Design a protein around this nucleic acid. Structure first.
Length: 133
DNA sequence: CGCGAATCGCG
DNA sequence: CGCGAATCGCG
C-alpha cells in the first residue's frame, strides 16, 4: 500500500547523458517542494541520486518523518550504498554533476537520517507524481 | 537513444 | 560456489 504523505522525487532527462533536472513534490498535492534547474550534462541515474539526497536533506531540515518514493532501483541502491556507481566520464563538461554527486555521497557518509526510501511501483500505481516532462 | 541493476558457460 | 559477458524500467 501507498503512503500518501510522502515526498516523490523525479528526474527529467533531455537525452542521456545530457541536460538533467529534478524535483521533489508532495505525493498528494503535486505541489513542488524543491526543484533543481537544468544541469547541462549528467545522466538519469546521477540526477535521481541527487534528487533523493536533496529530499533527505529537505526533510531532515524540516524535522519531517515523511518517506521518499522514487521509481529508480538504481538510485535507491546507490543511496543505500552511499556510492553513486556512475560510468559517466570525469572531464570538464561533467565536472559540475560529479562535484554535486561527490558532495551528496559525502553528506550520506557524515549524516544519519530516518526517512524510509521506498520504491514507487509504477506498474501498479501509475506514474510517479508529476513524472517529467 | 543511453544508463546501470539484476541469464549464460565455465571449472 | 564465484566470475564476468551480455533482460528490464526509465526519461
Amino acid at each position: 500500500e501507498i503512503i500518501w504523505e510522502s515526498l516523490s522525487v523525479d528526474v527529467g532527462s533531455q537525452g542521456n547523458p545530457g541536460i538533467v533536472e529534478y524535483k521533489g513534490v508532495d505525493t498528494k498535492t503535486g505541489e513542488v517542494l524543491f526543484e533543481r534547474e537544468p544541469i547541462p550534462i549528467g545522466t538519469n541515474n546521477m540526477g535521481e541520486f541527487l534528487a533523493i539526497v536533496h529530499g533527505l536533506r529537505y526533510l531532515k531540515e524540516r524535522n519531517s518523518r515523511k518517506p521518499i518514493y522514487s521509481n529508480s532501483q538504481t538510485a535507491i541502491k546507490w543511496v543505500k550504498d552511499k556510492k553513486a556507481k556512475s560510468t559517466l566520464v570525469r572531464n570538464e563538461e561533467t565536472a559540475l554533476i560529479w562535484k554535486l554527486v561527490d558532495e551528496a555521497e559525502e553528506w550520506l557518509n557524515t549524516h544519519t537520517y530516518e526517512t524510509p526510501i521506498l520504491k514507487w511501483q509504477t506498474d501498479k500505481w501509475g506514474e510517479i507524481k508529476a513524472d517529467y516532462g
